[PDB]
Design an enzyme around this catalytic site. Structure first.
Site, PDB file in Angstrom:
ATOM      1  N   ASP A 161     -69.197  16.024  -0.958  1.00  0.00           N
ATOM      2  CA  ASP A 161     -69.357  14.568  -1.228  1.00  0.00           C
ATOM      3  C   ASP A 161     -70.531  14.068  -0.380  1.00  0.00           C
ATOM      4  OD1 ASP A 161     -68.252  11.484  -0.808  1.00  0.00           O
ATOM      5  OD2 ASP A 161     -67.638  12.235  -2.755  1.00  0.00           O
ATOM      6  N   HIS A 194     -62.011  16.828  -7.591  1.00  0.00           N
ATOM      7  CA  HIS A 194     -63.162  16.639  -6.709  1.00  0.00           C
ATOM      8  C   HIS A 194     -62.989  17.332  -5.364  1.00  0.00           C
ATOM      9  CE1 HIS A 194     -66.618  14.644  -4.920  1.00  0.00           C
ATOM     10  NE2 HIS A 194     -65.865  14.039  -4.019  1.00  0.00           N
TER      11      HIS A 194
HETATM   12 CL   LIG Z   1     -70.752  11.742  -3.161  1.00  0.00          CL
END
Ligand SMILES: [Cl-]
Ligand SMILES: [Cl-]
Ligand SMILES: [Cl-]
Ligand SMILES: [Cl-]
Lengths: 303, 297
Positions: B107, B277
């Site tokens: 991220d 994610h």
């Molecule tokens: Cl990100």
């Protein structure tokens, strides 16, 4: 109305609670002559017209309605497709409301979400309209087609408020006064609340203070990201143009002009359209009341 | 708060911009791991042990995140641009005598990582990025579908204090919603509950939330412009590279991740992992083996 401490911003106008199959529509009604319906948007109520409706009432029978789910109109329970707050459903409901008054053919002016109800009404049911005016909007399809980094940062709330429930509801509910005032100020020319009558702001704040009213607004924007967009796409890809004589009015510093030339856009959607900017932010009838009222009087009065 | 790194020490590393907190364990070649939003270094707790079987593993809180200090921001959000964050982490690593090291990020931390690689490739022996494409590539793909999918890139980048005010109402809800909604399951069940508490406690501080908004403000502006210069120049990361992404993560949403990265890197391999994610927590076994095999090779 039924709220003791909210001001009457339409001195002389009557009040109507209009029944429809989808719930009651509240309206102020004044004047005499050809019928003209006025439709507010987000995050406002029917009182946004309080500075132009008296002038219009000198020439028309003026009906100033709260949108379905907004102001004091009833709030239908929504569904997985956000159906009652789609512009198609809202237009059907307001057509029903106008039939209750005996108006099957009328003039229509809308702003923001109310302008989206209004052109959707013209696409689905053109025989209902003598003339149509849309204030500071492009079609919902056109907003989304222009989406890019700059558009996404400049008009973020379309994607934010369309997020699945309860994400926007829970974020707006922590400090609703701050959000509604921030949205009102940020879209005006000056970027503050000076364009608004404080009594009108209190109407907007009291509406926004109701979590059911805020939920309706998110459902409105959810429909605007999904069904409304799909409805619009069908029309533009089929080349369907609104035949009703049309006026597009937008603020020089408003939303519709962000990355587009609005009259050129509306000529793609309407076969008999005229238009003009007005030096103003988004909230034309409160930021520039005299010029808006005159443009509407001249448009709706023209033979 | 639980200790999720058995066999790891805890270090405060001085830099000209403030302290960087890190858990440190293992021995061998140095490997730095960088978390993202809305998490802290503890997101690596399920893969850092396997990596520490072979490497000196340094698990750092990003500048302004977790327990690292918060340098004061400015009008171009400079300290939370990825270029600035990379410079600060280069300084922290120099405090440990590490001027050439392996790097994996996730991220925001993966964005620090590829910016580091573009700015100072001599610092890196190998680079791994988890569930991202370059910031420029997200923005170039920001159509209706993507603006709805990653709305927070635009929302959190709105001028202060709009996102700050909204996040302060119910911060527990937002951090938990972001964690849950990006996983494959859509709930919090893929996370260790003690890890979630770390994330919640950090997000409970208004100063930490402001920093996160500054991070996303940098991502919409300076970070994008930095990336755009590299695109216009034809610059490619020369460091051997691994792109891992979740089959139901963000990087694959509007693009083919390995096709994108090959435009940004001259020596990149990659693979999807069945996961949302949060690769190191949803799929710790497949993530750890992929990373071990890549950083050993
Ligand atoms: Cl990100
Ligand atoms: Cl009353
Ligand atoms: Cl609108
Ligand atoms: Cl618009």
């Amino acid at each position: 109305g039924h709220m003791p401490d909210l001001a009457d911003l339409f001195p002389g106008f009557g009040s109507e609670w209009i029944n429809t199959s989808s719930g009651r529509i509240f309206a102020r009604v004044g004047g005499d002559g050809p019928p003209l319906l006025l439709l507010h948007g987000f995050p406002q109520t029917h009182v946004m017209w309080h500075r132009v409706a008296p002038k219009l009432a000198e020439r028309f029978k003026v009906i100033v309605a709260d949108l379905p789910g907004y102001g004091w109109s009833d709030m239908p329970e929504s569904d997985e497709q956000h159906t009652p707050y789609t512009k198609r459903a809202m237009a059907k409901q307001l057509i029903e409301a106008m039939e209750q008054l005996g108006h099957v053919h009328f003039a229509l002016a809308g702003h923001d979400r109310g302008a989206r109800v209004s052109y959707r009404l013209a696409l689905d049911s053109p025989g209902r309209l003598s003339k149509l005016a849309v204030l500071d909007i492009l079609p919902t399809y056109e907003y989304w087609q222009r989406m890019n980094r700059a558009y996404a940062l400049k008009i973020y709330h379309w994607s934010f408020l369309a997020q699945p429930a309860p994400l926007p509801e829970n974020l707006l509910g922590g400090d609703p006064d701050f959000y509604v005032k921030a949205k009102l100020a940020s879209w005006t020319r000056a970027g503050d609340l000076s364009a608004f009558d404080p009594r009108a702001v209190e109407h907007y704040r009291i509406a926004f203070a109701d979590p059911m009213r805020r939920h309706v607004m998110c459902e409105d924007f959810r429909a605007g990201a999904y069904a409304d967009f799909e409805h619009d796409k069908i029309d533009v890809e089929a080349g369907n143009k609104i035949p009703v004589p049309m006026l597009a009015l937008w603020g020089a510093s408003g939303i519709a002009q962000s990355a587009a030339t609005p009259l050129d856009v509306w000529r793609k959607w309407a076969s008999d359209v005229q238009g003009a900017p007005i030096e103003s932010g988004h909230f034309l009838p409160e930021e520039a009341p005299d010029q808006t009222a005159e443009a509407l009087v001249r448009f709706f009065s023209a033979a």
